[PDB]
Design a protein around this ligand. Structure first.
Ligand SMILES: [Ca+2]
Ligand SMILES: [Ca+2]
Ligand SMILES: [Ca+2]
Ligand SMILES: [Ca+2]
Lengths: 718, 718
């Protein structure tokens, strides 16, 4: 318990004499406006500040803001600038802290470099009362914990009009965004499960999967290794083909079109929603540009320029940034190589002959993810330092610029193994005659038995479950408690309670996870349905986890008022527009959908497909290995062996040309590229069409603000 | 000579008794505001109106508009709403006519259905003085004719600040737009001529043109006709190949990229320019929506609804519109067919044996253009009537909706023969074995000897010269003089002079020609450079022709104030965005650029190309015609004949497969589609990049309006 103030202060009680020389000069400028009283307690002393009344409408009339009025037509109170209330207890704690903070920034000798220098350690508003606790006189924060930030309440709606009142429009605007995103994930998950279960129903009705699961063919493939791998039968790995038909179903194409159109209609819905939320709170968006002070090393450098009394260096460090992006790109694939090459050629030295091929893939991906989790912090640090070097003008430019430079890095290292698996996996190996030897010592890399699509789906699967759901939430809960143990192992007053809390670190690491997750929703659902489902399961946990992090474990933000999410809308629209071309390439060049359609329409010799797998397998002759690249010990799976088969669209060896590129390769390639053109153009046009149709401003808000303006006129004239 | 009034009136002097019963009830409502006097002269009587002073600041204060002030910092006078002048002769004639016209619309019993009923025939402001003439006391219109609307002055700049003062911001804004477009055409024409002359320099240095112009091959082609055409030699038509290399030069690809980027930078330049023109005239764009009265059959239908006291029918008539678009599309190709089939199989009955093949093409295109010129008016009329049926709410909705429905029609019938020539010409004929017989009586259509690109370039050429430059300007001058002869063959006072002038008919037919011409600039310069040149030559003539049409042959517009061109910006951005994909298809599928690159990189057997024309020609055997489709009288050009050649990428007849589709067809097709993907994506990204880079608001205007706002504050507080 105490009396009723606004903003605290945290000095460091015992150079030092200049610390006290500035520590008693600033508040002398603070005497004229705000009545301060300093308190002396156990650990480190603090400074207290209570606002005085008659300067508060000086600041409330200094800036234009809307406050509640007395008149109400149609069951709803109007708002104008500042008049007609007269309560002396109607200024909420949030707005009081806003005004007091404006005085905290305005007067100079603000707290930018005064706080950033070392004399002051923390400047922050306090909260009313306490969550849970005992015998509390109806706290707002207790109410908010009891209705919003509990795991037991995840079905009831977001109380957005209260969280705006207690945290401000920025923090309120975030949870509104996450609410609309999770609400839009419901039909995505329903349609995802319907398409996947349509996949599950008709697995054993198709032709091309039966052709592999059939016995009595005795068809043999080439060993896919340099020295030590043997011949393998087609019907051996047939579960992977069964799951392949579970994933590259002809309903998934329709699901991809549905997802592009889904992302577009989500953009429309959210524009409309923040428009009505800009109605309900603050309508005149004309904040005065160049309002705050400049960034202090720009004033320092500017002072150096005035001592001396650059359009080369910003572009120079932008090129530095692009360099870092390029070797980030190659670094991801480097680390993926190291990961798949964690345990190579271990067939011999244990001599147990497991041949399980599971631990190499599983621990490859898991070790890979450990290196990505470890490296992400480094990239964040390079973003902060580089943006510090560039010397932006304001705080807004620092926030925006740092946001973009962090996003490119996390995009690159968080997505590049999936680009390597989905596209560039088994493209570049030659015929079984000659192999493409990278580094001139051994082979590049070979695909899975039965298609590289499985490695994409299980890699993508354990990223949607590994890093997103379990790892990130477990550290997101786990870190602040451990910082609490660190800060401990080295009747209580209010600010002494709030000092033990952790300081607040912006909204960028909390939007960031959601932009990357949105990238997982829209960029790779051409080859993997039911991804939204995983996004929804992560999302329900994320909203309440973040809410409990606000109410429980953090001190209060200072309630910066803004009217849109900002740069994140451009990032969402960019990613959602990039999704179309990458879905076209995933469908055509990966999904094995084009060769089946071409075989149905050009080499059928009947109505349907049969002998498709007979058609793809390019017969080879085992006499033509390059003196050592033969299988080292042939398995003798049957009596003998004469010819191995492989899938590359090449002519048989007995023809007058052997081991060249056939007609069918160019036919399939032409059909693939034609699909890319048609898909990209039609889906760009549809995704534009649902922008042109849906009204970007809502009607009810336009007519209601028009009626409010008219009634404001006819009420004002009297 | 007369006294000084604002707005005229034209009644029809002798049902009739109701005409006079309303003719003396409206002006009784006009007595209260504006002092009218009626005059009685020779032909038909008129009514005169002079404004009275003290109601003019009632209307000038009724609406907010900016007028000149007394203070001037930095050599330029400020503007605010209405004060501080006090001249009683400072209201220009344009603004006086604006206010008087607002009273003409406001009071009701406005002149919408009062003028549209039949009692009033014309309501219009008059002009001061007269152009040229004799002894005129420094007319504004004489000045404007002497500086702007004369053919002798086409090099000196547009006097935009005077034409705005005399005609208003709409008509001024148009000539600003045409000024910026013609100014942007200068480097387009320079680079066009440089690329074309680079084509002209190195004609006789290449390989594939020499291969056709070479003698001593004795290579013979198949006759390309059903019954009566003979074998023709390759070296016969070699001028057409010479011009083909003049057009599909590898510099034209660079010119196509340059044109897409040119269109984008033109958009940026014009956004910036109308922004500063919105600075110089009127800055607060907040015109009150729903300001004027509704459209009178919507009030009539609304009255019928109120007698009765539809979201199906508007969409029904939209589908009607789409139907009209579809048979417009097929109608263009129908009329093109009739045109090329004007004189078919005339080799026999004259028996002169000219074999000139010129008159069929030339008169085909000319007859085609006559039908398009004749049909365009019909499509315009269907646009007006259909838009009349749809019953829009306002005048603005009628203007916009009619604009769009006119544009789709003129787009379709004005472009469809060029789509037929550039794309679908010789694609769909089979091998010389079997032909694709449309209508089951005779062959479809065959390409030119030496490529269908020539027919595209000469058709496109005589549209850029035929319909654009000569036909349209000749009728645009020719029509109003003939209407003057018609109106004649059935000391003078001012309104009696202005009555002989022709009424003004909006800006839509004058923007329309320029949007279609812009379509000719950006949509087909992949296969035809130096098109801008023709656009520039048309454009210089067009600006002065239109200007002389405003000053000389038309009565005055009523000066509607607007702040942008409107729908035409969306139409320009749409066409300029459609240009990229159509340039990709013109380069790949028409320009014969891909097969030369593929032959250079895959079948070279050396460094360079030689025997390219040897490679393309698919040898055929003349024994395999279908019993009558043989050449009827073989020409006996040599001793005998055994095999004819043709260009379709098919295997020779002596192989184990004959007359099927070879490997090389799929190879070339795959390369073509790959070029479409790469070109479309990279040019979309560049055309976006020059939007992201260039600041869409100018800096000087932003800082200058900020300084104007600050100085307005510190001048207002005193
Ligand atoms: Ca998380
Ligand atoms: Ca989180
Ligand atoms: Ca013209
Ligand atoms: Ca014209």
């Amino acid at each position: 318990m105490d009396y009723h103030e606004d903003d605290k202060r945290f000095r460091r009680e015992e150079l030092c004499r200049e610390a006290e020389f500035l520590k008693l000069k600033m508040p002398t400028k603070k005497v004229y406006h705000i009545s301060e009283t300093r308190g002396l307690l156990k650990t480190i002393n603090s400074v207290l500040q209570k606002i005085t009344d008659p300067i508060q409408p000086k600041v409330a009339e200094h800036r234009p803001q809307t406050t509640k009025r007395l008149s109400y037509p149609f069951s709803r109170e109007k708002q104008h600038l500042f008049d007609l209330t007269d309560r002396d207890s109607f200024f909420d704690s949030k707005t009081r802290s806003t005004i007091v903070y404006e005085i905290l920034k305005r007067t100079t000798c603000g707290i930018t470099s005064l706080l950033a220098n070392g004399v002051y350690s923390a400047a922050y508003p306090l909260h009313d009362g306490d969550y849970e606790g005992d015998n509390v006189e109806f706290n707002d924060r207790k109410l908010l914990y009891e209705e919003w930030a509990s795991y037991g309440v995840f079905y009831k709606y977001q109380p957005i009009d209260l969280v705006r009142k207690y945290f401000g429009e920025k923090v309120g605007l975030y949870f509104a965004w996450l609410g609309a995103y999770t609400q839009m994930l419901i039909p995505a998950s329903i349609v995802g499960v319907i398409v996947f279960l349509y996949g599950c129903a008709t697995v054993d009705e198709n032709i091309p999967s039966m052709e592999m699961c059939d016995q009595r063919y005795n068809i043999t493939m080439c060993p896919l290794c340099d020295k030590t791998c043997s011949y393998w039968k087609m019907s051996s790995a047939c579960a992977t083909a069964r799951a392949s038909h579970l994933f590259d179903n002809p309903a998934t194409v329709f699901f991809s079109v549905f997802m592009a159109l889904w992302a577009a209609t989500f953009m429309e819905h959210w524009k409309r929603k923040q428009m009505r939320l800009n109605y309900r709170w603050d309508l005149t968006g004309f904040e005065e540009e160049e309002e705050a002070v400049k960034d202090h090393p720009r004033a320092e450098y500017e002072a150096r320029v005035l001592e001396k009394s650059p359009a080369y260096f910003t572009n120079l460090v932008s090129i530095i940034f692009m360099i870092a992006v390029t070797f980030a790109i190659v670094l991801g694939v480097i680390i993926y190589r190291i990961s798949t090459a964690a345990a190579l050629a271990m067939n011999s030295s244990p001599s147990v002959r497991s041949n399980i091929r599971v631990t190499v893939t599983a621990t490859a991906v898991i070790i890979n993810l450990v290196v990505i989790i470890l490296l992400d912090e480094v990239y964040g640090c390079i973003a902060r330092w580089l943006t510090k070097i560039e010397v932006p003008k304001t705080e807004k430019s620092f926030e925006e610029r740092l946001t973009f430079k962090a996003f490119l890095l996390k995009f690159v290292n968080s997505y590049t193994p999936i680009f390597y698996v989905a596209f560039f996996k088994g493209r570049f190996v030659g015929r079984p005659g000659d192999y493409v030897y990278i580094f001139r010592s051994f082979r590049m890399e070979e695909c899975a038995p039965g298609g590289c699509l499985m490695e994409l789906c299980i890699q993508l699967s354990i990223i949607m479950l590994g890093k997103q759901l379990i790892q990130n939430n477990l550290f997101e809960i786990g870190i602040p408690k451990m910082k609490k143990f660190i800060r401990y192992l080295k009747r209580k007053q209010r600010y002494e309670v709030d000092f033990n809390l952790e300081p607040f670190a912006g909204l960028t690491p909390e939007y960031m996870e959601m932009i990357i997750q949105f990238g997982f929703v829209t960029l790779f659902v051409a080859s993997f349905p039911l991804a939204p489902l995983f996004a929804l399961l992560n999302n329900i946990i994320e909203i309440r986890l973040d809410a409990k992090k606000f109410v429980t474990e953090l001190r209060r933000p200072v309630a910066i008022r803004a009217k849109d999410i900002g740069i994140w809308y451009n990032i969402l629209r960019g990613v959602g527009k990039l999704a179309v071309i990458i879905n076209a390439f995933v469908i055509s060049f990966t999904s094995d959908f084009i060769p089946r359609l071409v075989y149905l329409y050009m080499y059928s010799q009947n109505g349907t497909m049969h002998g498709f797998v007979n058609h793809t397998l390019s017969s080879f002759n085992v006499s033509d290995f390059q003196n050592g690249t033969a299988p080292n010990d042939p398995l003798d799976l049957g009596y003998e062996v004469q010819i191995c088969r492989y899938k590359d669209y090449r002519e048989p060896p007995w023809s007058e040309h052997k081991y060249d590129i056939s007609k069918d390769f160019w036919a399939v390639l032409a059909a693939r590229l034609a699909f890319v053109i048609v898909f990209q153009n039609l889906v760009m046009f549809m995704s534009d069409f649902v922008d042109w149709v849906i009204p970007d401003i809502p009607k009810d808000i336009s007519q209601q603000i028009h009626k409010e303006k008219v009634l404001m006129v006819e009420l004002f004239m009297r």
